[PDB]
Amino acid sequence: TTSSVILTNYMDTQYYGEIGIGTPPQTFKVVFDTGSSNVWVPSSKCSRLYTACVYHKLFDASDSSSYKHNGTELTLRYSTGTVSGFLSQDIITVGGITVTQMFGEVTEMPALPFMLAEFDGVVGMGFIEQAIGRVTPIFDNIISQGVLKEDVFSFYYNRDSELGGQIVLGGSDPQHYEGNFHYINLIKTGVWQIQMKGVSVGSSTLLCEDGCLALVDTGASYISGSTSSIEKLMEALGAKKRLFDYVVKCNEGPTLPDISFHLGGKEYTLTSADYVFQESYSSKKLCTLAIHAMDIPPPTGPTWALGATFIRKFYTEFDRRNNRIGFALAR
Template sequence: MKGLGVLGLVALSECLVTIPLMKIKSMRENLQENNVLDDYLEKYPYSLAYKFLDNRPDPGVAYEPMRNYLDVSYVGIVSIGTPPQDFKVVLDTGSADLWVPSVYCRSGACSECPRPLPCPFVSLHPLGPSTLWVPGSLTGPPRPCLAGSHSSFDPLRSSTFLVSGQLFHLVYGSAAISGFLAYDTVRIGGLVDVAQAFGLSLQEPGNFLKHAVFDGILGLSYPSLAFPGTTPVFDNLWRQGLMDQNLFAFYLSRSEEKGSVLMLGGVDPSYYSGQLTWVPVSKPSYWQIAMDSISINGKVIACDGGCQGIIDTGTSLLSGPPDHVLNIQKLIHAQPDHGQYVVDCDTVDTLPDILFTINGVDYPVPASAYVRKSHPHTCHSGFEGLDHPFYPETWVLGDIFLRLYFTVFDRANNRIGLAPAA
């Protein structure tokens, strides 16, 4: 049996593609350094409700949580167009679409002097006729423009660019990102994805996104969450025969700026210890699984009798029902402070592990993981309340959990593999 397990690991690791991830300063840290974090927290009260709606109010609108990316710490590089234009993107298992800013974006987060929209895009509402056009059909050469805080995609620089004229709209809490859908060649980790659908933003909410280090988002959830009529990047990579196996995996480093990776089409067992434990996906839209309980020192404190959990690389914190999270905050002696919960840094070594039991296996999360050190003498709780209108017993396990446990997302078998990170 042991020999069979080794052979399985060898098979998993054949011909995988590894994409390095960079650990970055989070949007929260940037907002705090610029003294606008309190304004942000007031304007965007935390709620992931829209992200997990089964019945979306408008099928043509994708609903995303603005606060979801506040603590994102890892980004990868993807290239779009011919020749390639590079972008730092959040590789997000909690969404399915790819979008980046366009040079026509009318927001300080994109550019200080956006270019006027060319025909047929004379206005954002509507964007124009649904006919494909290529850069050669546009009139006038591109003009120099002051750069914004993010890289912006320029259709005029890509010979393989096509656009459908279809609007996309992402709702972020009380604000929104709007733009249009396009098609172009996407390169990720040496893989070349031809005619990939992606969004180009024309408007981004307020000025807060200019404090984000990432340019856009690349979703890795199931295609049911994608914008209608489009195929996500991962699915196209598989359909185009660019991967040996229909799976991907994440290893998130705990401290170093480098070392984190996304693996496509295989698994490298040197990134984890022991054996992978497999958990079936309970609902193939998000990477959703059934959890047994959450406990401290043998006492169940949440998820009593079972609940649902979503493994989400686009969320850094551990999010759950507000009343249960509040109970955890009290148990770890966290005190409310301007929309966050502060923990005495000197007590971290005395705080208990919090045990997530999944499919009969215990996954401890120590205080050194769930308490975030923001400044030399300031520590914050890594738990945050999730207000879900339909599924009150839903938890979202973000990077705090993923830094501890190497995670395989197996689309072929609709399951998630977990093992202690090396």
């Protein structure tokens, strides 16, 4: 079988789909995260002093009859934000499929960044090893059920409007991709990470000398790398730094050089159109790039993170039988 979940695009930095928890099902907007492995949604026991819990949909286990207790405390530590709560059990519905899943009822949600989020929670599509509290990941359960047509899933991210995107469990959709897929094996298992044999700034392969790591994060809005790495990189496009953003005069945006990522022998290039946010062409105004500098500590980092910016150009397939990642041109 094959099931797909349709996503929503909110300004190219947030892609969320919808899952249902409970009986009757309680609908929640979520982000499908290849960087984590736990599944969470806010909970009723979340104190209204956390403004985030007042702005998002909360899970009531008292209004769900399939709900089973579990106390287990949880602290998920993302690189941009943190949340805390306890384990819970109920039946989740993900685009057709129904799986009994253990999730976390968050009770602590910091307004930064949670207050910026159009979605309510997150669903980790990572391995059970980054799985906080060894709780079996939702993909692993759907697998166990024996219903999919393939032990894989793919992502499609679109470039706004003014359909968002789409996740397909069990395969790929040839309508959103063209040519042939090209696989890259995971270096280690338990992490959607692959090796990168340098990043090329225009005509100087000025980044990646000796080889680095690349985390394909569908739960990252930008492409990101080490402060240092990114630092040389900006130097080259010639960008000026803001709070925790980078920029260029809209005028010259469309003039920046191509950025190329060497994966598996092939090289995945990004045009200045793919990574620069062209909301104008003035000289008075500054445009934000979709590449951030973020130092990701081991054991996982240091790593580059191919997120939003990258998945928009290359449809991504997460092979779980063969443990590799395959990229192909998006449509």
